């Protein structure tokens, strides 16, 4: 894109035309165009547990409405279960034979053995209010941290105009936990931290774990100030010394920004003015200089280092002892690895 | 691993997926038997 000068000389006549083609940001674009899709997952109440069926049971309800001027014709429902969940067979037989509703026999007679993706055909969906249906789901695989499920809707003449919803019992709406700093977004689907319980507090073992490539840097820090935001907040930490030289230089020791997701404030809130011992990996810091920010994640480890006057309690005496031995140990002897 | 399944690391992925290939040129210079040249070209398949 540049400006230029046109110069024409001589007898005759002509026409000048200039067109620019570029990528323009979408203005009020409707991703779920012509579709209002709502999906809700809930556990089964006490009526299900009454005959002592004794198993993991949840109810999935789906509702949708067309936005067009008239009712939309035949459409298709693509449903993906959470991993290890199979829909209740008896619920689908009841829904299948209903009017404006059909499920293929080849899909129907599959049952629990392989029914993970489900295809439901509707001859039409009303445009004035929501049309709904529901069925039970049961876990039969017994695995934790299940994959979120999804339901996609589209019509036989156009897959382009479509809509997709996700569901997960703990992620509320089944959306991904991405972290965004204005225009720059990066994923944050992790545990908040490793090892803050410490029932058996070691020192020799921790030195061996500090000598592994997964630990890129070990910092002694002091929290200066916390700055709030919407779904995150940043923690202004002062770097005191680099116990292990990491991906970045010490730079005398100045403020470096650490950020925690809103779902990690509930797990553990750091307290200001206090010192902290931390270590992580190269994937933790984010952005480009000088706007680098350290994201607290499942590879990050943090523990409070009490101040001098706080060290005098007999149990925090030994903590200030052991946290001081790790200090001198790493710098002078390094690693035999 | 000691069990009866292939380990992940030694599983090598197919990745060559071009739509069109074998954009080559060749001249029929093989010995003409009944005026018809028989050419043999060993070609690499894709994934």
């Amino acid at each position: 894109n540049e400006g230029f000068t046109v110069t024409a000389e001589g007898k005759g006549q002509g026409t000048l035309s200039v067109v620019t083609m570029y990528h323009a940001k979408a203005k009020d674009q409707l991703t779920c165009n012509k579709f209002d899709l709502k999906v809700t997952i809930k556990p089964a109440p006490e009526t299900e547990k009454r005959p002592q069926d004794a198993k993991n049971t949840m109810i999935l309800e789906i509702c949708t409405r067309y936005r067009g001027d008239q009712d939309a014709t035949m459409s298709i429902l693509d449903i993906s279960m959470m991993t290890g969940f199979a829909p209740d067979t008896d619920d689908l037989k009841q829904l299948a034979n209903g009017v404006d509703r059909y499920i293929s026999k080849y899909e129907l007679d599959k049952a629990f053995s392989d029914r993970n993706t489900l295809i439901i055909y509707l001859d039409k969906v009303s445009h004035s209010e929501d049309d709904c249906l529901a069925f039970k789901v049961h876990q039969y695989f017994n695995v934790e941290l299940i994959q979120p499920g999804a339901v996609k809707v589209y019509a036989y003449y156009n897959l382009e105009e479509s809509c997709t919803r996700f569901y997960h019992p703990e992620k509320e709406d089944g959306k991904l936990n991405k972290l965004c700093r204005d225009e720059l977004c990066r994923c944050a689907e992790e545990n908040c931290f490793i090892q803050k319980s410490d029932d058996k507090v070691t020192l020799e073992e921790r030195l061996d774990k500090a000598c592994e490539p997964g630990v890129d840097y070990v910092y002694k820090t002091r929290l200066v100030k916390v700055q709030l935001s919407n779904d995150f907040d940043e923690y202004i930490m002062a770097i005191e010394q680099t116990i292990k030289s990491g991906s970045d230089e010490v730079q005398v020791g100045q403020q470096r920004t650490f950020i925690s997701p809103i779902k990690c404030r509930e797990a553990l809130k750091l307290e200001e003015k206090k010192h902290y011992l931390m270590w992580g990996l190269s994937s933790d810091f984010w952005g480009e200089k000088p706007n680098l920010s350290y994201i607290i994640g499942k590879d990050t480890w943090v523990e409070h280092w009490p101040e001098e006057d706080e060290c005098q309690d007999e149990e925090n005496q030994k903590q200030c002892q052991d946290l001081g031995a790790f200090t001198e140990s790493m710098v002078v002897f390094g690693c035999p690895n | 691993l000691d069990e009866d399944i292939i380990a992940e690391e030694n599983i090598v992925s197919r990745s060559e997926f071009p739509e069109s290939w074998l954009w080559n040129v060749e001249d029929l210079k093989e010995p003409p038997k009944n005026g018809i040249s028989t050419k043999l070209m060993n070609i690499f398949l894709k994934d």
């Binding site: 083609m21 570029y22 014709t73 035949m74 298709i76 693509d78 059909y102 293929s104 026999k105 080849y106 899909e107 993706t117 295809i119 055909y121 001859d123 036989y156 003449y157 897959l159 | 739509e19 069109s20 954009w23 040129v25």
Partner: protein
């Protein structure tokens, strides 16, 4: 004569094309050829000029499609230098697509329709994967009437049939036709044409092909 590696391309991909230059006796001739590539509305975007002498009547050329492009029909047009009014052309399409895994053929029992046939038009569906295996799925098929450039759609001729053993069957009855049209005269329908549009989706829900029989 103009040859291309594919019939339809993606934005941001390379286009390879070869031009065969022959005289009126179809033997290879060595002359200078003027080549032009035009956009959907006929705007030349790229042009070439090369002689086929000592190349045995073959001119291999290439061009890259930018990401900034207007999808639609694109045409390669060529003419000899000593005959600029005699222009040859061949077309290709630009679209954002994904490769299917199976083909859909819609076969009427007769490649015509007799108006007063009581049974109606029978169209056999045939679907198979690209590697030669039978397709299992469900298809949605719709009918319409084509008169010149004017297309009329019959909404109630829509049917939903499963695809079994790599095949299906659908029949457009005479009653649906008489009900589809508002004209009780059968004489006005003679000379017009029908068209069939089929939408097939596997029972895995991971692929979909739209096929058309017309005329």
């Amino acid at each position: 004569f103009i040859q291309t590696d594919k019939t339809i391309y993606t934005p941001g991909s390379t286009v390879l094309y070869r031009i065969f230059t022959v005289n009126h006796k179809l033997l290879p001739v060595g002359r200078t050829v003027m080549v032009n590539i035009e956009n959907p509305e006929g705007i030349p975007v790229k042009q070439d000029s090369l002689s086929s002498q000592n190349q045995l009547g073959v001119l291999p050329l290439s061009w890259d499609i930018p990401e900034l492009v207007n999808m639609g029909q694109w045409k390669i047009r060529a003419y000899y230098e000593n005959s600029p009014q005699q222009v040859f052309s061949t077309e290709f399409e630009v679209k954002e697509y994904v490769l299917p895994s199976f083909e859909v053929i819609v076969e009427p029992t007769e490649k015509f329709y007799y108006i007063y046939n009581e049974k109606g038009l029978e169209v056999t569906i045939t679907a198979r994967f690209l590697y030669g295996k039978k397709v299992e799925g469900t298809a949605f098929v719709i009918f319409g009437i084509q008169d010149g450039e004017q297309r009329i759609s019959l909404p109630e001729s829509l049917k939903r049939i499963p695809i079994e053993d790599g095949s299906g069957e659908v029949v457009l009855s005479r009653k649906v036709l008489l009900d589809g049209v508002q004209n009780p005269r059968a004489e006005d329908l003679v000379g017009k044409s029908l068209y069939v549009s089929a939408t097939v989706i596997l029972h895995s829900g991971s692929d979909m092909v739209q096929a058309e029989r017309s005329g």
